[PDB]
Amino acid sequence: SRRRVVITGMGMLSPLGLDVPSSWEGILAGRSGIAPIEHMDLSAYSTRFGGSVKGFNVEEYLSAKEARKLDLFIQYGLAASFQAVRDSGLEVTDANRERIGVSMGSGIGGLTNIENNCRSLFEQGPRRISPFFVPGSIINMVSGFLSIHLGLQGPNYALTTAQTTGTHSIGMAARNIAYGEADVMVAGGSEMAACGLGLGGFGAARALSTRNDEPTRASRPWDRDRDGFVLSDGSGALVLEELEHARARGARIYAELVGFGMSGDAFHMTAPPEDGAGAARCMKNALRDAGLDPRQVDYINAHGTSTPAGDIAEIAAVKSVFGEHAHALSMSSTKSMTGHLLGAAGAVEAIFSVLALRDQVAPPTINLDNPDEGCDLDLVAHEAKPRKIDVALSNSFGFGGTNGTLVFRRFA
Amino acid sequence: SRRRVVITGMGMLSPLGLDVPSSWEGILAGRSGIAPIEHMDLSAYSTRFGGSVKGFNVEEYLSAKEARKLDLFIQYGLAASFQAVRDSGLEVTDANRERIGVSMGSGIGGLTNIENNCRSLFEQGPRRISPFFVPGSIINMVSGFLSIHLGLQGPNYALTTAQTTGTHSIGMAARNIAYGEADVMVAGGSEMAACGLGLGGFGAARALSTRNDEPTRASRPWDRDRDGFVLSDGSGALVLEELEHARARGARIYAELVGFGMSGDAFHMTAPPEDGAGAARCMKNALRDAGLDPRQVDYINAHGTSTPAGDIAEIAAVKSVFGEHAHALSMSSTKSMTGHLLGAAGAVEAIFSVLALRDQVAPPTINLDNPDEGCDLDLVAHEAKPRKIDVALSNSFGFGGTNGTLVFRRFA
């Protein structure tokens, strides 16, 4: 048998704000965080907009000297991680430090640091490569730097499962706690891919919306005029905690993480199967894991990337798993507002799934002006919908056909 | 409840050979795979050598058309994965595809591809970035492409924990099986960081041996004249199987994986503690997890990177964990011969640890001419040592204070 896992701390950088409550405010108001990218010549690029983190002050978290050593994606992860730990009220001690671990991931990692260090390599030669290039860029340095700053001696690792990173990180952090390997984990993901390599790289695959004239309308999941995902930066971190540990210190419990599902499509490198067979298996795995019937699910935070084939696979998958319950659950894409934070998408959308539970409100899918063929589910078009939510799912579907599902329940 | 996990398949590319048996023959003969690098011009670099994979033919495994789109670290990962699965005799069917997953990781991932595409972006512009840049370079696409080629629909993920990646990948994959999330897992890691950014980045940090004039003598773990690690390329993959599943199909069992430890040092971004504290916590977690008396340990495959601080930390950790039994077990570093395969180090060394059990021989630490102050254990200097090995331990340490231990024993 198995220990129960609750959420006692949440932290976030998003295109909607510098913390969870500002972000959540934007979500329920249907605000877009998408805009032309600044301080950067995108003249030769077919996409010139995305979700940037606006006004981020790393010196709230690190000295200028330590921040200079770390890629933006690491700064973002640390910000969310430090917010999440502070939000939890947890005190690290000699008595508990070996029971507190970290799993903060990234899908794409340190492109900004790779670009600057390439610029030096090609222009001047290898002698201008930063000494901090490697430890300042490697994906596991959010877990590493967090563990060093706070003295965490529990499981220390990082997932990289592309657009599924955040979902997987949180789920496998929850298994560490459930199976007694840890009492507390900081888990989630961070990403800064709004640079030339990210816009360029995704641009070259024609994966990105090129709607440069109306950036706020670019991300339009399940809408017949969608033309690919919007690329976005940020981080999400949760403090996961064994229930008895949380109750003993009198922790505030936002929700219970009751279920985690993983699956592989074994289909295509970037395209999901049309019927979403992988996403269906993954969601069924998560519900079986939670001991729940599909009928008990009230809210789904969709992957909902605004890609032609991705959005319609998730409709198929939901209809397949949920049968005659499929129209009764509400399902929304907060990527309609935030765009796609890649590896951090699962982390911030777990937070939105938890806050949907706390506030009894389904976040909207904005821009859903003209649902596409078969997109006839309750996709919460345009406006937030207050409703009953006991159980919320969060899905992520990534490149290589890697799937993640998290199941959260109201706690009382 | 918690199930037992055995090794039924292994695969490898190393600087010593294009498979396991060829690589193992090199190990037992004390051969170095380190040589001046030929595939690029390093006259600007303070390190001009490493452990290259020599004569690798990707068209033994994949079509030239798909090979061309993948970073060498993905090619190496798939080659080792394919060997391991063939070596297992396992047949993937509709009855078991959902119960077979893959966790093949990398420390640095697609550095070559990112460099070349970064060169295209700066010299030419974003219209010259490869459409395959992202799916051909990101760390999770070994697990991704393996699942697509073999039809594996089980848990599909990747770790990135720097020089610990391979040990963590194998360990967490065993936990998947132990806890019933899968019956089979292909796990390990791959690395190809020998490009300008790689040798330049580690060179900027002064982390690498600069013994350019005698590369086969550069990697000299615990030797007083060591001057940093030797960068090497390749792949290790293992087929992990639930015991009863392996028994049921009459699989050949190399060994049982009885123990896994993880621990963060929470010490420093890149330097390990002098006293071996994080390593010690990790090995103790691993030994308790295996339900072992530490005097049961016969053979330790050390991290053994040929850094001043790393090498002596490990002696301290082993003396602290094993007390007087530290003087009875044999410890060696195959990095004396392979060099440091970073995220793939834990995977090839897990295979060497298993083969030490099959053949009852401790691999040598070559180039240990003048052991350093306090390096007074049986380090298997110069020559392989036939000896009783019931229990073998494999240690990895990484940047971020991230530690891993695997415990294998002979299976009757």
Ligand SMILES: O=C(C1CC1)N1CCN(c2ccc(F)cc2)CC1
């Ligand atoms: O984003 C990508 C691929 C699309 C290109 N990368 C994968 C490997 N990771 C990496 C880590 C450390 C380092 F030194 C360099 C690269 C993250 C960057």
Ligand SMILES: O=C(C1CC1)N1CCN(c2ccc(F)cc2)CC1
């Ligand atoms: O000169 C410095 C400042 C500490 C003073 N370095 C920063 C990068 N560090 C590092 C070590 C190994 C390595 F492979 C990569 C990076 C340590 C060296």
